[PDB]
Every structure is written in C-alpha cells, then in structure tokens.
Write a protein that holds these residues in place. Structure first.
Motif, PDB file in Angstrom:
ATOM      1  N   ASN A  52     -13.750   0.708  14.400  1.00  0.00           N
ATOM      2  CA  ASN A  52     -14.106  -0.630  14.895  1.00  0.00           C
ATOM      3  C   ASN A  52     -13.783  -1.724  13.751  1.00  0.00           C
ATOM      4  O   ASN A  52     -13.061  -1.377  12.759  1.00  0.00           O
ATOM      5  N   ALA A  53     -14.222  -2.983  13.869  1.00  0.00           N
ATOM      6  CA  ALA A  53     -13.894  -3.933  12.817  1.00  0.00           C
ATOM      7  C   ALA A  53     -14.553  -3.574  11.504  1.00  0.00           C
ATOM      8  O   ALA A  53     -14.022  -3.844  10.380  1.00  0.00           O
ATOM      9  N   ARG A  54     -15.719  -2.944  11.587  1.00  0.00           N
ATOM     10  CA  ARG A  54     -16.572  -2.726  10.397  1.00  0.00           C
ATOM     11  C   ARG A  54     -16.474  -1.313   9.797  1.00  0.00           C
ATOM     12  O   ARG A  54     -16.982  -1.091   8.690  1.00  0.00           O
ATOM     13  N   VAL A  55     -15.870  -0.396  10.517  1.00  0.00           N
ATOM     14  CA  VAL A  55     -15.611   0.968  10.070  1.00  0.00           C
ATOM     15  C   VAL A  55     -14.181   1.224  10.415  1.00  0.00           C
ATOM     16  O   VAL A  55     -13.806   1.277  11.617  1.00  0.00           O
ATOM     17  N   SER A  56     -13.314   1.471   9.428  1.00  0.00           N
ATOM     18  CA  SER A  56     -11.899   1.770   9.717  1.00  0.00           C
ATOM     19  C   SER A  56     -11.261   2.371   8.464  1.00  0.00           C
ATOM     20  O   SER A  56     -11.905   2.454   7.418  1.00  0.00           O
ATOM     21  N   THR A  57     -10.028   2.761   8.606  1.00  0.00           N
ATOM     22  CA  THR A  57      -9.378   3.608   7.628  1.00  0.00           C
ATOM     23  C   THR A  57      -8.576   2.808   6.636  1.00  0.00           C
ATOM     24  O   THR A  57      -8.152   1.695   6.852  1.00  0.00           O
ATOM     25  N   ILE A  58      -8.288   3.437   5.491  1.00  0.00           N
ATOM     26  CA  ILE A  58      -7.373   2.916   4.471  1.00  0.00           C
ATOM     27  C   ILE A  58      -6.143   3.835   4.417  1.00  0.00           C
ATOM     28  O   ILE A  58      -6.264   5.024   4.423  1.00  0.00           O
ATOM     29  N   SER A  59      -4.965   3.241   4.370  1.00  0.00           N
ATOM     30  CA  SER A  59      -3.724   3.973   4.254  1.00  0.00           C
ATOM     31  C   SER A  59      -3.589   4.741   2.957  1.00  0.00           C
ATOM     32  O   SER A  59      -3.928   4.222   1.880  1.00  0.00           O
ATOM     33  N   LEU A  60      -3.037   5.925   3.022  1.00  0.00           N
ATOM     34  CA  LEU A  60      -2.628   6.633   1.871  1.00  0.00           C
ATOM     35  C   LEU A  60      -1.387   5.966   1.260  1.00  0.00           C
ATOM     36  O   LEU A  60      -0.669   5.231   1.947  1.00  0.00           O
ATOM     37  N   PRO A  61      -1.142   6.207  -0.015  1.00  0.00           N
ATOM     38  CA  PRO A  61      -0.087   5.469  -0.668  1.00  0.00           C
ATOM     39  C   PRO A  61       1.279   6.053  -0.384  1.00  0.00           C
ATOM     40  O   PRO A  61       1.453   7.274  -0.286  1.00  0.00           O
ATOM     41  N   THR A  62       2.272   5.192  -0.317  1.00  0.00           N
ATOM     42  CA  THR A  62       3.671   5.606  -0.107  1.00  0.00           C
ATOM     43  C   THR A  62       4.477   5.693  -1.410  1.00  0.00           C
ATOM     44  O   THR A  62       5.600   6.138  -1.392  1.00  0.00           O
TER      45      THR A  62
END
Ligand SMILES: N=C(N)c1ccc(/N=N/Nc2ccc(C(=N)N)cc2)cc1
Ligand SMILES: [Ca+2]
Length: 224
Positions: A97-107
């Motif tokens: 949701n807006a308040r719980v979400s993921t962070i991308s792993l690095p490329t």
C-alpha cells in the motif's frame, strides 16, 4: 541515528522494525513476503513490524507479522561480521500500500561520493544511549574503500563498505543494525557495525547488498 532528523511519517515504506519484546534491529522489505536484515540481528523468533513511524504508539498503518524463516548467510562470521546479511520470510505476505511497500535491489554497486539515506530507531547519542520513538533519517555519502580501510585497518572485508562523515557527528548506531542504506532508489547497504557512533575517523560499516543479489534470488527460490 546520531545527528539525523525525524523522517516524514511513512515516507520510507520499506523500513521495518524487528521486535522480540522491544525493537532491536531494522530491516528492509524487498517483496511482499521477504525482508533483508543483518545476520548479527538473528534471533530464533522475530516479529516484523511494518508501516511504523512512532514505534511506541499504534497509529493505524502498522502490520505485525511473525518471521517464518530466518536465514543467515552461511559464510556469516560472528567475530569479524564478514557476510553480515540475512533474509526473513514472513509467515504471511504484507499488504502493499502507500505506507508499506518494497525497495528495489541494486543493479550496480554505488560509486564513492553518492548520497544515500540511512534510517532507523537506533541510538541517537555518541556517548551513552537514548532511543527515539519516531523513525530517524540521515543523508550521508558513500566513502572510498581507502577511507574505509584507513578507518578500520585490518577489519574491512570484501563484503563491507563505509558510509558517513570522517569528521564525525552524524552516523548510524546501535539498533539501527539491519536497516537500510538506500541510494538513488536502491538498497545498497545493510547497517552492520562501527566503533562508537559518530566519532571522528569511525564511520559506519555496511554490508554490500549488491554482492548478495544472486544469493537472495537463489535463497528465495529454494525456500518458496
Ligand atoms: N551496534 N551496532 C552498530 C551499528 C552501527 C554503528 C555505527 N555506524 N557507528 C555502530 C554500532
Ligand atoms: Ca506505531
């Protein structure tokens, strides 16, 4: 976090609190059901707290989910903190949701001089300890490998890099451990260790997340 500022509420929706009675470490949500943290934050039972701002008060956006699997990197060395990374599989998926979400792993790895964002509910003092209610943030740059090595001679392994200020004054600290260093929208570091907090020539030492992307992929696939 020493020398930081209170983050905007739920502005880091990937930041998690690891709780075992009280907050003890941070982590980063990388998918609905998986969290990255530090292997030195291992406990046999962990509750993951997502959607937090004030960790002392229920505000309405929290999700508390128990860890079902807690998987340290097999080459974690508990004396030197080499390979200080772990994965947590949640017992049920988080609702994104807006308040719980993921962070991308690095490329790619982050270049020295890149400005990053470090966060957590860890100690805010360079001498002694005081723990905040609300999430703290810190803007800090990636240091060169030579600066890292000169700060901690003989102690920086190939899994580690430094972020911070050699003059001191601003740093991560105890109970920030396991939490994120995000640079240009990607998870580049895990808060790992240091000598003291915010001392001259003693920047924070972080696990190089880029070195573990394949390990994360493989470990998740095998535990799915
Ligand atoms: N204890 N865990 C810990 C975490 C980070 C630091 C630091 N960045 N100085 C020190 C200690
Ligand atoms: Ca709360």
């Amino acid at each position: 976090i020493v020398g930081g500022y209170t983050c905007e509420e739920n502005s880091l929706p990937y930041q998690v609190s690891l709780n075992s009675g009280s907050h003890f470490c941070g982590g980063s949500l990388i998918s609905e059901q998986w969290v990255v943290s530090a292997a030195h934050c291992y406990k046999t039972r962990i509750q993951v707290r997502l959607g937090e701002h004030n960790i002392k008060v229920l505000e309405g956006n929290e999700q508390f989910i128990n860890a079902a699997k807690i998987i340290r990197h097999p080459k974690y060395n508990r004396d030197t903190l080499d390979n200080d990374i772990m994965l947590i599989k949640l017992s049920s998926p988080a609702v994104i949701n807006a308040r719980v979400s993921t962070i991308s792993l690095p490329t790619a790895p982050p270049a020295a001089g890149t400005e990053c964002l470090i966060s957590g509910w860890g100690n805010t003092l360079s001498f002694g300890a005081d723990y905040p209610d609300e999430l703290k943030c810190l803007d800090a740059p990636v240091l060169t490998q030579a600066e890292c090595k000169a700060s901690y001679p003989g102690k920086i392994t190939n899994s580690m890099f430094c972020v911070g200020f050699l003059e001191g004054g601003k740093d991560s600290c105890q109970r920030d451990s396991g939490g994120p260093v995000v640079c240009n929208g990607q998870l580049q570091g895990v808060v790992s260790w240091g000598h003291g907090c915010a001392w001259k020539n003693r920047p924070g030492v972080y696990t190089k997340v880029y070195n573990y992307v394949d390990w994360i992929k493989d470990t998740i696939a095998a535990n799915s």
